[PDB]
C-alpha cells in the first residue's frame, strides 16, 4: 500500500502522534494517517478478522492475547539493543505464547487524585473516607467519586487484602486459579458496598459523573489515570496525584496496563510499521510529541521515563504501578472482566450480597 | 404461542436454577414487577447496562449466569422474565414465574 | 424544536424529497433536513426507544406494527377528504390496533425484469426457465439471477401454489395460523432448490451479485422492485418490467409493501410533520419531485398513480401487486421473516431438505 | 474449565434435540469438520450470514432452532459446536459431540 494507518483512542494525544507521522513522511514519503474511531478494541478484531483494518492499533496489552490467539497481530522481533531501551516487564506484558506481539508505549496505573483546595492533606486509608464524607456533606460536598461501572476502577480496593485475577505459575496463567471470591476480595467489595449503603457514594456513579463532579469542585477526590489529567488541567481545579489509599493496612493494588502498539497481521506495511514504532515513536522526541499533546503518564522507554518521573503525577503513577498487578493477557480476560463487572455492580446496587456476587463471579471467570 | 405463566417447583430456602421459559433465540432478562402491579416499575435483578439506584434485594439472587434464586417468593413483587427476540428487541413477551414449594 | 428531520433509505430519491422540503421551508421558515442513514429500520427503534431520533421515518409498513406496539409512532387522524385521495387498502396497511400510524406513500411489489436484447419474449412460466438457462449457457449467459438471501424475493414463488404468512380472519391476524410448510410452499421451494441442484442458480447469489450480473448483460432476467430501476437506467441494458412468471398455472404472489411515512411519537413537531406529509409531499407535485429523482413505482395517491400507471413498469408493478398479498404488520413478522429466511437459505444451500426446513420454520414462526 | 468432548445418547435414525454443551452467555454455532480432520474446513449447518456453496447434508439437520438432528454420525465428518462468548467473539472454544446409540 505504501501508507501507514494508525488507530488510537481519542482521549490520547493523536495530534502529537500525527506530528511524529509527518516527520516520518518527510523522511520516507510514506503518509501516516492517525484516526481515533470509537470502540477500537471492538472495531479492530471485527475488521481485522476479515483481513482489513489499520496497520497499527494502540490499546492496553490485556486485550492483545485474544488478538494473538486469532492471529490478528504480527509477531515483532526487535533487536536486543532496542529491547534494552524498554523496561523488561513491559516486554513480558506483550508476549503471548512465546511471541512478542506489540511494542510497549506507556505504563498505566490508577492513582488517587484530590482537590488541593478542598483537601490539602488527602487521606492515607480507605477507612477514614466515611468520616471525611460526613464532614464534607455539611458543606454540600462529597469525599470521593469514581467510576463504579468499570471493574478496573474498583479492583485496586478489591485486590488490596488478597484479591487477584489469574494466578501466574510456571510461566503461564492458570485459567482455573481465580481469586475474586477469597477473603480479601470479599472485604474489599464489602467496604465499597458499605460506602453506598451509608450514602457516601451512589451506585450509578460512572466515568462521566465522577469526572464532572471532580472537575467542577463538587467532590474532593476521584480515582483515575493519566488520560484524565488534561480535562482537569483546563478545569482550573487545583489538584494533586498521589498514592492510592491503603485498605486494612495493605496498599491498593491497581491493575497495571501497558499501552502498546500492535501491528495488523494483515498489513502489507509491516516493515514500515516497525520502522515507525522503533525509530520514530519510541524515542525521547517521539514520545515527547505525544505526551505534549496529551500526557501519557509513565512510559516504557526508560530514557524518557527518567525525564517524566520528575513530574510528581508520573511519580505517583509509578508508585501505584509498583504496588499493583500486571493484567493477564489470556483470552479468558473477557469472561473475567464481565464476571467481575457484573458482580461489582450487582453488589453496589443491592441486587446481590457481596458473598453471593463474588462466589458466582468466581465460578464463571474460572470456567 | 408463548405461555404467559410458568409454574415451577423448588425446595424452599435453597438454591434453585430457574428453568428459563424464554424460547431459543430469545434473550432472557429477569425483573421484579413491584407489588405484582402491572402499572408499577420493573426492577432489574441483573444490571447489565437509565438511572441505577441501590435496592436491597437481600439473599434472593444467588447468581445471574445462570439465573439462580434462593427458592422463595420475592418480597418486592412478582418474578418476571422478559423474552426479547435476537433479531428484533421490539418483539418481546413477558413470562411470570410462580413457585410451588416441595 | 421548529425543525423537521426526515429519515429515508438511500436508494430512494432523497434529493427530490429535499426539494419538497425546501418549498416547505419557503412557505413556513421551518428547515427540513433529509438524511439517509444505513439500517434505518434498525436505527430508528433504537434511537426512538430512548425518546430521540428523526421526526419522520420512511419504511415499508410491515415494520410499523412492531413500532406501534412499543409506542414509537404518533397516531395520525387525517380528514376524510384526505383519506379518500389514497387507495383504501393502503390505509389498512398502516392501521395498527385500530389506529392509523403512518401515511402511505408508495405501493411496492416485485416484478420480472428482463433484458430485451437477450430475451425479447420473456417466459410466462417458471417451469420453462430451466430449458432457457440450458440454452443461454451455450452462449455463456444465464436465464435468471435474483437475491436468494432475502425471503422477500423468494416468497412470490413460494406463495403461488398455496403459501401464506399469517392468515387474516375476523379483522385480525392469527399468530398460530401460518402457511409456510403447506403443499404449495413445499412445491415452490422445491422448484427453487432444483434450480440450484441443476446449476441454473447459485446458492450464494445475493442482491449485489444479481444486480451486477443483470446490469452488465450477463443474465437475461432478474426479480426486483422500483428501487432498482435507476441503476439499470444508467447501465444501458435494454430492459422491460413485466408480470412475474406463473408456477403450476398460478400467478406468483409477491408480498405487497406500502412505503409509508411515520411520525416519531417523541417528536415535538407533530403538527408540522402532518402538514408536510399531507399538504406538500402527498400531492402530484410533491410525489413528482421524489419520483423524478428516483422512481417510486406505484403510489398510494390515486390522482398521481393515474399518471404513473402510464409507465409500463408501473403498470407491471400494479398487476403484480394485485396478484400478491399485503404484508402483515404484526410484531411477530420479525420471527416470521427470520424463520423463512433461514429455511430458504438452508434449503437453497443443501443444509436441509425442503420439507424439514419448512416444517421447522412453520413451528418457529407460528410460536 | 470447558470440556472438549460431549458424549450424548439418542435413538438412532430418529429426531434428537442436541443437548447444547456451550455455557450460558455463549453463542452456539454448529459445524461439520470435514473428515474429522482439524486441518480440513468447517461446514456450517445453519447459514445465518463468505462464499456459500451447495452441499447436500441430506436428512441430517431436522431443525436449526432448536438444533435437532436425525440421530446419526454425519457422513461428511465430525459434529462440532463453536461456543462464542457474548461479550467477545474472540473468546471461543469448540466442543465435539459424539453419539452413543441406544
Ligand atoms: O474495566 C475493565 C477494563 O479495564 C481495562 O481498561 C482500562 C484501560 O486499560 C485504561 O487505559 C483506561 O482506558 O481505563 C480502562 C477502564 O475503563 C482493560 O484494559 C480493559 O480491557 C477492560 O475491559
Ligand atoms: O426479506 C424480508 C424483508 O422483506 C421486506 O423488505 C423489502 C422492502 O419492503 C422493499 O422496499 C425492498 O427494500 O426490499 C426489501 C427486501 O430486502 C420487508 O419490508 C422487511 O421488513 C423484511 O425484513
Ligand atoms: C433469605 O431471606 C429470607 C428473609 O425473608 C429468609 O426467610 C430465608 O430463609 C433466607 N434464605 C436463605 C438465607 O437461604
Ligand atoms: C437418513 O439418511 C441415512 C442415509 O445414510 C439413512 O441411513 C437414515 O436412515 C436416514 N434417516 C431418516 C430418513 O430418518
Ligand atoms: N467459520 C469460521 N472459521 O473458519 N468461524 C470462525 C469464528 C472464530 N471464533 C473467529 O473469529 O476466529
Ligand atoms: N426495563 C424496560 N422497560 O421499562 N425494558 C423495556 C424493553 C422492551 N422490550 C422495549 O424495548 O420496549
Numbering used by the authors:
A (entry chain A), C (entry chain A): 12 to 378
B (entry chain B), D (entry chain B): 16 to 64, 69 to 121
How do the authors describe this structure?
The nucleotide sequences of SARS-CoV-2 ORF8 were codon-optimized, and an N-terminal 8×His tag was added for purification, and an N-terminal maltose binding protein (MBP) tag was added to facilitate its folding. After many cycles of crystals screening and optimizations, well-diffracting crystals were obtained, diffracting to a resolution of 2.3 Å with space group C2221, and refined to Rwork and Rfree at 21.49% and 24.53% respectively. The ORF8 protein was crystallized in a dimeric form. The overall structure exhibits an Ig-like fold. Using a mammalian cell expression, the ORF8 protein was expressed in soluble, and we observed four pairs of disulfide bonds (3 intramolecular and 1 intermolecular disulfide bonds) from the crystal structure, predicting that SARS-CoV-2 ORF8 forms a stable dimeric structure. The dimeric ORF8 is linked by an intermolecular disulfide bridge formed between each monomer of C20. Furthermore, SARS-CoV-2 ORF8, like CoV RaTG13 ORF8, has 3 intramolecular disulfide bonds, including C25 and C90, C37 and C102, C61 and C83, respectively. As expected, the structure of SARS-CoV-2 ORF8 we determined contains an N-glycosylation modification linked to residue N78 with clear N-acetyl-beta-d-glucosamine (NAG) electronic density. The lipid-binding pocket is a hydrophobic region surrounded by four residues Y46, R101, F108, and Y111. Similarly, the distance between the inserted lipid and the pocket is shown on the surface with electrostatic potential, exhibiting the relative positions of the fatty acids. This electronic density region is highly consistent with nor-n-omega-hydroxy-l-arginine (NNH) fatty acids, which can almost fit into the pocket entirely.
